[PDB]
Amino acid sequence: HERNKTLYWGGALWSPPSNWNPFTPWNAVAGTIGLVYEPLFLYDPLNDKFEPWLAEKGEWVSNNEYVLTLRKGLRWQDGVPLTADDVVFTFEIAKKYTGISYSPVWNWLGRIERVDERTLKFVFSDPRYQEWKQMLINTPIVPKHIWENKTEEEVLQAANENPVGSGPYYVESWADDRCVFKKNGNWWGIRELGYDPKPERIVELRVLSNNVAVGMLMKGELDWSNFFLPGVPVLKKAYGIVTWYENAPYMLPANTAGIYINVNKYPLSIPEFRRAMAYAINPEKIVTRAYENMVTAANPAGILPLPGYMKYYPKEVVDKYGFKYDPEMAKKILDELGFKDVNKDGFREDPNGKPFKLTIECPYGWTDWMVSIQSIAEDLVKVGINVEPKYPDYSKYADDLYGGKFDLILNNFTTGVSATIWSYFNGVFYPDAVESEYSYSGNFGKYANPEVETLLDELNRSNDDAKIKEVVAKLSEILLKDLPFIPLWYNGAWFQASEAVWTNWPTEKNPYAVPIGWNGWWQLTGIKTLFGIEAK
Ligand SMILES: [Cl-]
Ligand code: NA
């Protein structure tokens, strides 16, 4: 592999490459969706615009009808035409096979009509405009001719080695420590979009230690890093490394990191106690100690600071109902609630005099989160709440998170950048969590509020900015008053690059793509990174 034609990339491969199944992207090699399999649209979160990808055009032609026109001349990597039949298949297979992740689409999509050879009309029983935006960017189109013979379990359990997609790269080889993608010189995007991927190969590397990753970046052996790497601010200063911003906070935001609270456990069940905890926490201590100013603290509502979300920011609500670091306020609230240190041991007991302690947890070995929860636990101890950090192995953390068996838990899985603010509120408030044993979609502390469910549905079912702004204000007001989740900071969209070989990376001063190749991000313009870089 000629060095100046090969891009070495790390930050998303954490186990030996073994799965490339577009139906299970959470288990697939990162890039499966983006490099190999493609969506109808991209969403540009920097400019708050959709970009027709496989689709030439898509629009709502009535309240419950969405007309999609596919581009002409699309082909699968095996030379078979990609047509509207493959799109129909991609949706209808999930009607048949309910174990497919997006099978619930059929609860609100009624039918798909064939308008002409490349045009489909989606006829909705319940037009969920916000949720539809997420379908448009996150559902990969798959080839009927490859998947149509399979049973449900064959579909869901397939490793899908040598995946046949439509995208700009295919898998050439793999090993325990890498997946090698090779440029598809026939990619339809070259002729149809005028986009030409620059690397002939992309080598996706698994790197076992942060010392090796940072060392490789310094030596120009790793071109593109989506790893969290401590010390980047000093290394930039001393040695030179590309980041999105020249100064703090260095990185774009990826999601809202915060504390989910078990609202069904006394005294966490008292909304004012939750508010006291929020006043007690100093997010700037996390920004400095855990992240060396590579993140920013969140606004109290936790709304990501990107244009598609901020055009709905409820400033008057936040001004009135927000919180901030103020330990004296925290103590005042606790005193009013009757949580006083009667045993004289430095910890407040409950108003009946009964001692209690709480845990806060994050996964073992996730060092930045460990520092962060240690910092949180200290701040809470400082206002007399007995909190101890715990660091369960990942599988126990995940059982605690999804099962709801925690007191306080640090998480950011459902609050990522997306094509709609609805996904943030849904990830914080996910009403069905209250009724299921396990929730994977948010509201892990199982907060129940009928007004929230009504409002989230009104948000989903609106396509009107004025109404959306109103709904977002009411949702934010409830989040701030009841705090089942306490937003703390925006975790970074970690990006560093070496210019040893490749240059012209996207940055704040040349912001032509979001340079993140984690799963979910190719469709947020990560793919466009590959059209702009150039080899020295
Ligand atoms: Cl549903
Ligand atoms: Na006490």
Ligand 1 center from residue 102 Cα (angstroms): 9
CA distance 493 to 515: 9
CATH of the domain at 74: 3.90.76.10
CA distance 536 to 309: 38
Ligand 1 center from residue 393 Cα (angstroms): 32
CA distance 196 to 183: 10
State which H helix or E strand residue 122 sits in. strand 119-124
Shared domain for 373 and 273, answered yes or no, is: yes
Residues sharing a CB contact under 8 Å with residue 297, sequence separation 6 or more, in sequence order: 283, 284, 286, 287, 488, 489, 490
Ligand nearest to the CA of 107: 1
Q: Which domain holds residue 71?
A: 16-162
DSSP three-state, residue 190: helix
Nearest Cα neighbor of 281 from 162, 136, 378 is: 378
- Bridge partner list, 279: none
∠ Cα 145 105 122 (to 5°): 75
Which of 113, 139, 162 is the C-terminal boundary of a domain? Answer: 162
Shared domain for 228 and 319, answered yes or no, is: no
CA distance 177 to 448: 44
CA distance 151 to 167: 25
Shared domain for 134 and 281, answered yes or no, is: no
Ligand nearest to the CA of 356: 2
HEC string of 326-371 equals: CHHHHHHHHHHCCCCCCCCCCCCCCCCCCCCCEEEECCCCCHHHHH
Shared domain for 70 and 196, answered yes or no, is: no
Shared domain for 180 and 199, answered yes or no, is: yes
Task: Retrieve residue 29's tokens.
Answer: 């090699």
Which of 140, 162, 184 is the C-terminal boundary of a domain? Answer: 162
Q: What single-letter amino acid sits at 91?
A: F
Task: Retrieve residue 176's tokens.
Answer: 């325990």
Q: Which residue numbers come right before each break in the chain (C to N over 2.5 Å)? A: none
Q: What single-letter amino acid sits at 37?
A: Y
CA distance 37 to 24: 12
What is the CB neighbour count within 10 angstroms for residue 337?
A: 17
CA distance 135 to 129: 10
Cα end-to-end distance, the chain, whole Å: 16
Cis check: omega of the bond before 249, within 30 degrees of 0: yes
Task: Retrieve residue 180's tokens.
Answer: 């090698």
Task: Retrieve residue 305's tokens.
Answer: 């600071």
Ligand nearest to the CA of 430: 1
Shared domain for 413 and 527, answered yes or no, is: no
Shared domain for 86 and 213, answered yes or no, is: no
∠ Cα 492 262 228 (to 5°): 15
The total number of structural domains that make up the chain? 3
Shared domain for 65 and 207, answered yes or no, is: no
Region of residue 415 (phi > 0: left; psi between -120 and 50: alpha; otherwise: beta): alpha
C-beta separation of 369 from 362 below 8 A: yes
Which of 104, 136, 162 is the C-terminal boundary of a domain? Answer: 162
Give 67-73 contacts, CB < 8 A, sequence gap 24+: 67/115, 67/119, 67/120, 67/121, 67/122, 68/40, 68/119, 68/120, 68/121, 68/122, 69/118, 69/119, 70/118, 70/119, 70/120, 71/118, 71/188, 71/192, 72/118, 72/192, 73/188, 73/191, 73/192
Ligand nearest to the CA of 426: 1
Number of H helices, E strands in the chain: 18, 20
Characterize 447-480 residue by residue with b for buried, 16 or more Cβ atoms within 10 angstroms of its Cβ, and e for exposed.
bebeebeebbeebbbbeeeeebebbbbbbbbbbb
CA distance 361 to 388: 8
- Beta strand 201-205 with 178-183 is antiparallel
CA distance 187 to 197: 9
Q: What is the CA radius of gyration of the chain?
A: 24
Burial of 357: CB neighbours in 10 Å, binned 0-12, 13-18, 19+: exposed
∠ Cα 321 331 316 (to 5°): 10
Residues sharing a CB contact under 8 Å with residue 21, sequence separation 6 or more, in sequence order: 27, 28, 32, 156, 158, 159, 160, 163
CA distance 474 to 452: 9
Shared domain for 362 and 441, answered yes or no, is: yes
Experimental method: X-ray
CA distance 145 to 442: 36
Resolution in A: 1.7
DSSP three-state, residue 15: coil
Ligand 1 center from residue 104 Cα (angstroms): 5
User: Dihedrals φ, ψ of 534, to 5°?
Assistant: -140, 145
What is the CB neighbour count within 10 angstroms for residue 400?
A: 19
Shared domain for 444 and 499, answered yes or no, is: no
Shared domain for 208 and 321, answered yes or no, is: no
CA distance 425 to 415: 8
Residues sharing a CB contact under 8 Å with residue 64, sequence separation 6 or more, in sequence order: 110, 123, 124, 125, 127
Give how far Cα 298 sits from Cα of 204, 364, 478, 488, Å. Answer: 32, 24, 17, 5
Ligand 1 center from residue 105 Cα (angstroms): 6
User: Dihedrals φ, ψ of 24, to 5°?
Assistant: -130, 60
Ligand 1 center from residue 108 Cα (angstroms): 7
Shared domain for 92 and 182, answered yes or no, is: no
Residues belonging to the binding site for Mg(2+) are 341, 343, 345, 347, 349
Residues flanking ion ligand 2, Cβ below 5 Å: 341, 343, 345, 347
